[PDB]
Every structure is written in structure tokens, then in C-alpha cells.
Amino acid sequence: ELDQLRQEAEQLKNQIRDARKACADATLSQITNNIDPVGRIQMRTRRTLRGHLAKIYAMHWGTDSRLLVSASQDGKLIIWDSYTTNKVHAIPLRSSWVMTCAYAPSGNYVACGGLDNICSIYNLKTREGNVRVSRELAGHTGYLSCCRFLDDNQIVTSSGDTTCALWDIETGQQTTTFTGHTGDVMSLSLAPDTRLFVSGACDASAKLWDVREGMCRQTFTGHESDINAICFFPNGNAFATGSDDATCRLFDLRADQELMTYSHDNIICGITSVSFSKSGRLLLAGYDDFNCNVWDALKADRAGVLAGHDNRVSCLGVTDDGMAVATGSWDSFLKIWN
Amino acid sequence: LSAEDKAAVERSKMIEKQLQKDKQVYRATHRLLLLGADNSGKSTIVKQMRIYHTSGIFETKFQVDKVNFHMFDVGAQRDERRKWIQCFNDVTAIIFVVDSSDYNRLQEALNDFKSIWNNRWLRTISVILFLNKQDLLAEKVLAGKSKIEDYFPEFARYTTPEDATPEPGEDPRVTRAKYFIRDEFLRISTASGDGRHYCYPHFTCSVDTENARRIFNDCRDIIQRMHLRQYE
């Protein structure tokens, strides 16, 4: 009955706990005791992009390391050239409350979503010079939190109704739906080889998903409050999470437990965004404090600080060739660091 | 500069020419967030104010004396709201509607008001409070079937304040109960405030037509206080 099932669940949880305790034969910080610190990392602004009218809420770099897309809650999606600070495109939206955006790897499409439970897909290269709406994808019962392209005909969405979905653009219907969380989902990140993806939920829960089968394979716990950001390490064998309790942590998918935790005693505000560097030696985090912190991944110490914002930092990104860092905050400005 | 550079700069200049029009249109429109429970009459106030003119949000536009208000109502969401509420940290006002004829559910309304009043991202946003469905309260108190002191003991020692205005000619008991309910909210509002935001209470029923003016007057008061803060 129900009681027998609950007892079985507790027993298997205990067995999993023993299996995970039996594997930690070494400490990450003790092997890395002999590694040289990177030193002090001072970074300066090279450009400041002005033009939004309200909070900037999402951002994304392009495959060409030269073009950006940015989204604001005044109802705008702007496409920038970061070399000359020129504006290439500016698109108005049907719904003002936007919470995510993305580029496509081929540079032909963009996507957006928000409180209205819809993902809108836009075409950049048309017969004329106009950017027009190609698709409206519907089927969720909650707001969209994140979306990322796989190719020109497949997209992934995560929502605040506790489920994730894979969509085929040409027809307009779901091919597979992933369930298992209890609270809302907050973020996603795609593998370098594009066959799996990770998810973090408004709980102390993160999961790994196989796209083709459509089922979960691993779950990870360890936080105290909501998870806010997540991303992949370059080799696809790690990920780093931030949470609304002033703690970041690193997980690996082969030892199946955490390895390092980045925290401090005077930090009492949560993390909003996370992003890795090219070689894996820098980990960049945003705090509503209102700062950005640059941590050394293998030592758990702050290598640098970035300041110059007057309000909460909400989005952060790095390039594919590793030549810049872009930061966007609730004061309506974007800044590029190098 | 070659042909390409001139083309790029010209296109950028046109884009800025458009954003200038957008900024003027944006700053002259006011935005309000509407909140209430399922037994509130909130839908009826929406339908009433519409005379002044699936989906996860609903929008209404109305206009008073050439000023434009956009009111936003939340639908098709779950029962947890500690995340999307943060999107509403730069609105002019929150309109909170509450049913005052149901004694069994007033405590939940009070706790809701406490949670909204003390959040981190909403310490600058003011609240306009509507106490709805007064005729039902009048009928229930006059009939005398259920006793208010069963749920709130302190009502056994409350005296009508001197600044009351029972204008229409009602029974004194209606005035006592009405002002007790109002003071229950004013106490929370006064206790934890810091002079940075206020609460404006009103008594409303299902046939009133004066709600738009009330919102209008309260908004003028809010904006004057901002402009006076600008001059120190």
C-alpha cells in the first residue's frame, strides 16, 4: 500500500546515501592545495550601450562573437553590434513582460517568451529587409523561464508549471515532454555535443535529461532554498549552480556528488546569474548587491570584483572566442568588459 | 568611410529617431497591478471599469481626464507567487480587493496584506485598499445570526472612534463593525511603515461608479510626494 511504498522509498534513499558516502575518498581543496592563485583580475569597461527604457531582463551572445540580442520589460528586443556600438535591429513585441531570449546557431532566427505562456520565433533574413514573426508555440500552463535552440527546426522550453518540452517548429507541436519536478523550473543549459541537458528547480533539486529517450537519469540535491542559475562546463562533464541563499556549488556527473562550494560569511544576498570562462578557470556570478564576482574555480576564492552598476544585476555572458564579458542590470545599461 | 560604414551609421540614426518617439509615449502611461481572492468581486470591478474605455495574463485600458491607465490581472498561473510578483516592482500602485462579509476568511486576507506590505521589492509601492460587499455585512449584522466576537475577541471592548462619518443614516452597530474591520488593516499599515509608502482605504459595493476617480486622486497624491522628495 501507500505505507509500504513510502518505507521502500526511505530504504532506497538510505541505500543511495550510503553509496554516495562510500565514494568520497579525496577532497577537491586538498589536491588543489598546491595550485598557484591567479592573482588580482582587474577589468575595465570598453563600451557602454544605452537605449533601453526599463530593466534589462535577459541577454545572449551570438555565434559570431560580434552581435548581441537583449530584451527589456518596456517591450523591446534589440540587436547590437558590439564593435562599433551600432544598432542593427530593434523589434517590438506583443507582450511586454519578457523573461528570456536566444540566438540560433546559424544566425537566422531569434526567440522570446514570458508571462504569457507562449514562445515566439522571429525570422531575421527575409526577402525584404523586415523582421517578422514566423511561429507562436503554445501548450504550456505557466510562464516561460528559459529557451535555447538546437537547430533551425528544434527548440527546448522550460516553464513555471514544473515541466519541460521539446518542440518541432515546422509543424508546431510537442515531440516529448519531461516531468518530475515539484516546483517551478528556472534555467537550462545544452551540452557541447547537444544530446543531454540539465535543469534546476525552485527547490534544492537539479536533474539531467536525455533528449531522445525522454526520461531523467540523475538527480542532485544539496541547497537550502531556490536555485536561480545553472550552466555547463566546457567538456560537458560538470555544472555549477547558484541559489537564493548566498551559495554556489559544483557538481560532476560521474562521481554523482558535489566537489566544491563557493561562499563567504559577509555575503547575505543571493545569486542571479552564472557563466563560465573558456578554459574553466574563471567562474562569473552576479549578485543583487549590486556586484559581479569573479571566482577561481579550483580554489574557492574571489579573484576579482566588477562594479559600476546602480541596481540589481540580472544577466551575464561570455563569448565563444573568450574576448569579452557582457553584463546587464536593472538600471537599463549594458557594459562590455575586457 | 566606405559604403558599408555609411550605411550602418544611417541605419543606426533612424533606429534612434524611432526610440525617441517610443520614450515619450512610454513615460506618459500609468500601470497598476490588481490583486484579490476568488470570493472578492474583482471580476465585477473589472467589468464595471471597462465602461471607461490558455492566456497567462489579462489587460484592461481605461482613461480619466486624458490620463491613461493600464490595469493588469493575473490568470492561468499556479498558487505560488513568490517569483513573478517581482516583475511588478515599478508600478504606480497595487489595488487590493477584499470581501468583508465572510468572517471565516478575513484572517487569510490579513495575512496576505502583511506579506505584500513587507516584501523587499515592494517597499516603495503603495496600496489602494477596497473593502467590498458592504450590503451583505449590513444584512448579516442586522439579522444577528452570527456573532463577530466569536472570531475576534477584542471586538467586545471596542468603541466607535470620534472621527467617524456615518453619513447615510445607518444603525450604530453597522458603523462599529465596519470601522473595526478597517482598523484591523490600518494597524498593520501603520506599524511597520517608514513614511515611504501609505495605504488608502475605501468602502465600496457592487453598484458603485466612483472607483476610477478614487484611483485618480490617490495617484496624484503619490506623484506629488515623489516630486516633493526631488526638491529635498
Epitope: T182, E224, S225, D244 | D79, R82, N118, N119
Partner: nanobody
Framework: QVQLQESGGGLVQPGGSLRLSCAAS????????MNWVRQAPGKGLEWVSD????????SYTGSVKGRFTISRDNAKNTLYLQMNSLKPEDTAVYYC?????????????????????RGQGTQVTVS
Amino acid sequence: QVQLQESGGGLVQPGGSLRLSCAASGFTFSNYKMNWVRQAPGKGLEWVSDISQSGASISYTGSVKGRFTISRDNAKNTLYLQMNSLKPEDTAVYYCARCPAPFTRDCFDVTSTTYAYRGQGTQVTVS
């Protein structure tokens, strides 16, 4: 992994008394605001009592204002409630509830149909 476990239920006569204990694991106990909620046979989730980080601020609902007493032990990781005179209108299932964020005075989403950080509950019957 956040865990909350309740204890102290049972059956009593009208006018009786008993004590409820909530035990915790998986977080720093000191930084969080704490609550008592209950569910009666045929209704939704209600709110009974509230206590703050240090214990210098308390709050009760009207219907139990003169009878039930709340306390917290931050060193033993426990929340305590004491019941002195019971009516038949108290037969219910009792849960102890946490808050989503540390260092905060607001408290959203405790009485919801699904909430992450909440225990299994205990049964109290008076007859």
C-alpha cells in the same frame, strides 16, 4: 535535503492538554521564520501561530489566542507548541512550516496546496 518531522498527536477528552514537537534537519535553524498550520476534516489549510528568528516576536490567531503557547529551541533544532484546553473544533492534522528565504520578514506560499518545505503531519482528536 530539507526534512521536517512532527510528533505528539493522539486522542484526548475535552478540556485536556498536550504538546507538539517539530524536529528539523538539513539547514541552519537560526535564520528562518517559523509557523504552525493545520487542516480540518473538510476545509483548506489554515494558519495558527508564528514565531521569529530570535523569539522576541510572536503572533497568534484569534480562535486560539488565550489557550495555545508557541516556543522555539534554536540549539536543539526544535519547534514547540503547547495546548491547554481543547474544544471539539480542534480535531485536525498539524504541520510545522518554514520560510523560503533567510534574513526576511515576508513569508509567501506556506498554506499552498503544494509547498516544498513542509512535513508529513500529526493527528489530533478530541472527543
